[PDB]
Write a protein that binds this ligand. Structure first.
Ligand SMILES: CNc1cc(F)cc2c1[nH]c1nc(Oc3cnc(C)nc3)nc(N3C[C@H]4CCN[C@H]4C3)c12
Length: 355
């Protein structure tokens, strides 16, 4: 918030490849999903509905509070227009892109917002408003939501066809990580509907893709920070997420799982026996054969460099570590035969490193 930056859309139209992946419009669809996901994470949306039409438009709808429409004092336009028609960025010092990138790279965009008993409607073309915000209908006060339909512009894309298969993979991936979410998908070209809703979240996922029944951390929290995790050892899946988006280069949340596991194995070796007390085991050793998914839900996810691929928040590391240690120790201290096996294989990895 120290520096706030506001431009028009020309830099996006001039270098589309710096604001999206231009093979197809999927990344644009991702921008819209991400916003609707932020409304799920804030506790207000439970439903994300996606439609692919035969005219090659894409519609995404949620049942959240609805994108605000109040007039900005300084900019003299509604929230929906302000967010759609200008590039928003900023930070702490100089030297995610926003839905305006989708508006910019689209010949047409329509927004329907339900709030405060009103159905609002607005239309853009090539990133400029062309039909004013207007109340077109009325509705129950608790009938709320945001719905965006957009028409990707062929001049900015190698192909206007949506890659359906990757879109489906992505939606499933997200529904897995948020049990309070139900995602629906309708492809009117292929005549195909899907519904993803995972009541037990990640349960069973590792099994499908020691302990024999993998360990699950189920919605652990400290204030406005949430942790879901599943892991086991094996002879491979190693996925981590922040706010439902992959962190292919790990970070503080992973280091958190790593340290929390080490601490748990080290303490258990110390408090038991197993002829392993004299083996110099490392965090790396107890992590070596670990298969897991960890998914954290935090307030202001800070990342590495200028990209969003490695979580940096220096206090997530001990948020995860402490939780993993406590939960895993409890489990170790009620599963004797398997603890012993986990410990032994870990010692084996350590001895092979030392030799
Ligand atoms: C496909 N659906 C969809 C699509 C979409 F592009 C945006 C929203 C969207 N649904 C939304 N719901 C809310 O809800 C809010 C209401 N009030 C406040 C203060 N914040 C969020 N806000 C929304 N906003 C406001 C901004 C805050 C974070 N992201 C921006 C987009 C959306």
């Amino acid at each position: 918030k120290s520096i706030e930056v506001l431009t028009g859309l020309d830099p996006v139209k001039k270098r589309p490849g710096m604001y999206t992946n231009i093979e197809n419009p999927n990344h644009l669809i991702q921008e819209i999903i991400d916003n609707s996901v932020d409304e799920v994470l804030a506790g207000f949306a439970s439903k994300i509905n996606i439609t692919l039409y035969e005219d090659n438009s894409i519609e995404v709808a949620d049942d959240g509070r609805g994108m605000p429409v109040d007039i900005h004092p300084e900019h003299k336009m509604s929230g929906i227009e302000l967010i759609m028609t200008k590039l928003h960025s900023g930070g702490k010092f100089s030297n995610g892109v926003g839905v305006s990138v989708v508006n910019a790279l689209s010949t047409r965009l329509e927004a329907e917002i339900k709030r405060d008993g009103n159905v609002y409607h607005i239309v853009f073309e090539d990133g400029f408003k062309t039909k004013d915000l207007e109340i077109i209908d009325n509705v129950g006060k608790k009938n709320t939501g945001t719905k965006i339909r957009f028409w990707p512009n062929k001049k900015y894309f190698d192909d206007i066809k949506v890659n359906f298969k990757a879109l489906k993979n992505l939606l499933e991936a997200k529904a897995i990580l948020c049990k309070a979410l139900t995602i629906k998908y309708s492809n009117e070209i292929k005549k195909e509907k899907l519904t993803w809703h995972f009541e037990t979240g990640l349960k069973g996922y590792l099994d499908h893709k020691l302990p024999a029944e993998p360990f699950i951390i189920d919605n652990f929290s400290n204030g406005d920070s949430y942790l879901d995790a599943v892991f086991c050892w094996c002879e491979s899946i190693k996925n981590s997420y922040v706010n439902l988006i992959p962190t292919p280069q790990d970070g503080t949340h992973v280091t958190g799982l790593k340290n929390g596991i080490y601490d748990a194995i080290k303490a258990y070796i110390e408090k038991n026996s197993l002829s392993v007390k004299n083996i110099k085991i490392t965090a790396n050793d107890s992590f070596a054969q670990l298969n897991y998914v960890i998914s954290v839900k935090i307030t202001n996810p800070q990342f590495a460099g200028q990209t969003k691929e490695k979580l940096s928040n220096k206090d997530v590391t001990n948020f995860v570590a402490t939780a993993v240690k406590d939960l895993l120790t409890i489990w170790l201290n009620q599963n004797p035969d398997e603890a012993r096996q986990i410990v032994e294989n870990i010692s084996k990895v350590a001895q092979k490193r030392i030799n």
